[PDB]
Amino acid sequence: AKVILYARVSSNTDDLANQVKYLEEQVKEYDLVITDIGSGLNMKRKGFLKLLRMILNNEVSRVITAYPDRLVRFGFEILEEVCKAHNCEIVVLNQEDKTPEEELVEDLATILVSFSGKLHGMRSQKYEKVKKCAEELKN
Amino acid sequence: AKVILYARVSSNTKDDLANQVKYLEEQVKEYDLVITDIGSGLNMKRKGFLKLLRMILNNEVSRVITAYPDRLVRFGFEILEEVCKAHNCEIVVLNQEDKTPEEELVEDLATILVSFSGKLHGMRSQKYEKVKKCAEELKN
Structure with a gap:
């Protein structure tokens, strides 16, 4: 039952550090922070792949993210079906x-x-x- | 554990889907179920695809055979493969x-x-x- 923070920027135009700070401010109890620099389209993100594999291995209770598109650009629905099946909740802080x-x-x-x-x-x-x-x- | 053929066309523009199914069946002689959808690979509400995804996630599926990768989805094929790997399922595409x-x-x-x-x-x-x-x- 790990609680995970996932943070992503397409580039550091510091933006990633600040996104993490915001997550940790919002969610004070957490076990792990996974970050990626890259596109939400990018299926080879190591942070994202690590996180997906952990959800599928039933290690995760909750993934917290700042915005709907931090995890993916497309296919949010699939990740929702995956999480629900592995008793994992996706929490997006802002709508x-x-x-x-x-x-x-x-x-x-x-x-x-x-x-x-x-x-x-x-x-x-x-x-x-x-x-x-x-x-x-x-x- | 089930062997499933998945076929999809964005529209029947009549026998388009039926011919895809038939092609699949000629390649895979032993299958348990055929699931089909008419709609876009972008459409995350496809009944067939959702039935399929839930079955994989519920450990019902040994193998899914499809004509090529974009039959399943337009984006996120890699997510599906990760899902299948964790659920003892293999996606077979007859053409890469x-x-x-x-x-x-x-x-x-x-x-x-x-x-x-x-x-x-x-x-x-x-x-x-x-x-x-x-x-x-x-x-x-």
Whole structure:
């Protein structure tokens, strides 16, 4: 029955340290703090993978996070099904994301590059539009 | 422990899903159940996918066979694999690379673009107009 704090920033634009401080201020009793620097899209985050594996191994009673999108950009519902099945609770301290603009744009750009690759392989009329879109998002 | 075929199409645009099921069955001769969904890999409310996920989590599943990874989900395939590993379950994809129809990818991108533009508008970001313009280009 570990109580865990998970904190994530896409980059330190100090922001991560401050997110941790806020969590620990809000949740005074906790066992472990896991952090990652990287995107919520990034499925290779070591902190996130450690945390997921711990939930699945029934070590975790509660994961506390500052905002809905600290854990993932997509698939929150899956993590919710996982937690519920392993008697783990996900607690998000604030109801609305406070996502920096650069994080959203960064994430969109990652996705668009991904899709252009998927569209390019087939040679879809749509490759160029998606490619242009990614470019425009960097301007 | 159950061997399950999972098949999905974003729409029947009639025999599309039936042919996916049939393809699966020709590759896996011994299976316990076939679970299907019509909807997007982005749709986290798919009844079939949710039944499946709960079964894996309840230790009912030995193996899930699907045509390729994006049949299961558009994002988070890696989370599913972690889940399966902890629950003595293996996901088998008959092909490593997705063979998604063009229409499906464009539709998924349009859904994703709508979601981001909503958030950009919410924070009054000047990128909103670029994102709207992209969704429009993809609808053309």
